[PDB]
Amino acid sequence: ARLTAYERRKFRVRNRIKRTGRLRLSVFRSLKHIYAQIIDDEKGVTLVSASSLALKLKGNKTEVARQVGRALAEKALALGIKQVAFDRGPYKYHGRVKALAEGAREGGLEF
Amino acid sequence: MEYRLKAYYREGEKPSALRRAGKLPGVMYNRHLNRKVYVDLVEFDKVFRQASIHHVIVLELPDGQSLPTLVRQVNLDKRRRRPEHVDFFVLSDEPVEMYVPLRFVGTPAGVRAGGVLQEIHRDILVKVSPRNIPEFIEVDVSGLEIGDSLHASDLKLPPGVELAVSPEETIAAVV
Amino acid sequence: ALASTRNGRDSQAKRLGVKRYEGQVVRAGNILVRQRGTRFKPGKNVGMGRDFTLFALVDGVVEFQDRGRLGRYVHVRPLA
């Protein structure tokens, strides 16, 4: 079975975002951690990084996430960055990933 | 049994001219070498009729070296059906694919007088360490009966080296 | 029918193709390619209309891009 539902859903949501042409606020979330990476395509480049992994914090993976989102805003807004669009990758906008997003205001936003 | 020809070199010298010159444009190569070369037609002809991409050809040419070549391609121009150019493949010690002619040995060997003979190949493609090159392969298999097909490894496979296969194909049969 | 002639039609040429090529100056709205399928996909600063028609979104120059199995792509480069 070639090219799984994961990587279709992946690609589908990604390309739609990439067309609007904002910077990309891209979300990886593993079983353990949740990472978030703000990217400018066409320079093929990451600008503002934020992990739970590098902020070494724990318990309630969601409340961890609102935090790595507030982490990104504070970090990012400091470079001038305000408007972006939310990548959300192959993940339902829900729970942990919704939480990192609604934590990614105080800066950033419309999300 | 052993064949040598001649050879020469070229850089410019439009092939059409050389070709009118009784000569035969060609090229010399292998993993290590590639070089423009011409030969004499009649000469090439007399040998290649025996040699025929089957037995090894030692060329010669100046330097003077003697280069141990297999002929891997011949282009005839289709109108006059006569060679317009030649690939000379030079051997060194690494295994090399090639076409070995086949000796069909026996009598009708079952359904004597007679089956229907039916040779489905004069050749086999086989990987061979150049050093030992099996200048034919006796295929006896006097079992040799109606409707049957020998495939591959049932061939003698003289000492040197293995098939370039496919291990399953058609050699001969009687029907 | 069969013989007398049952044939004899055809339809108007649709005058389809590329209407602006690489390194050619265009204005917002210029249409760059006229085409049947997605034969060229819209790139940077390039729209698609309902009939798959590619237009410049901005003034600029037009650059062509062959992304291999991703298709060919038409963008408009600004300094518009």
Binding site: - | I53, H54, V74, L76, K78, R79, R81, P83, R122 | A3
Partner: protein, 138 residues
Amino acid sequence: MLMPRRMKYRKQQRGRLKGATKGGDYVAFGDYGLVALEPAWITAQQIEAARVAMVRHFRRGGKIFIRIFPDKPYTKKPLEVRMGKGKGNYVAVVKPGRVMFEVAGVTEEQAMEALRIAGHKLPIKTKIVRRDAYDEAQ
């Protein structure tokens, strides 16, 4: 007769006889060949006329390969004048250097004498050939 089953289109444009070449030409199945010197549309009925010349020539014996085939539909009008194309009415398009026919499993004098008869039934000049190193291995 000799003729396809299943055509995709009934009738097809004449086209050129140009650029004598392309495929066939190397004597792949048999002992001697008959090679085509000139271009022509050779007709399903000239082919059969050559075949039967040859099979008649040896004892129902020998083996024959043919190796050109009439897939090109040949139209003709009735003694009308001009409206529509058509009709009817098959050819193989044959350029120089092609081997048609090509016998095997017969003696040299036989093959060569059959092929010479076979050649008389054709609209073009021909050449009889034997077989070669040059006809390679493949």
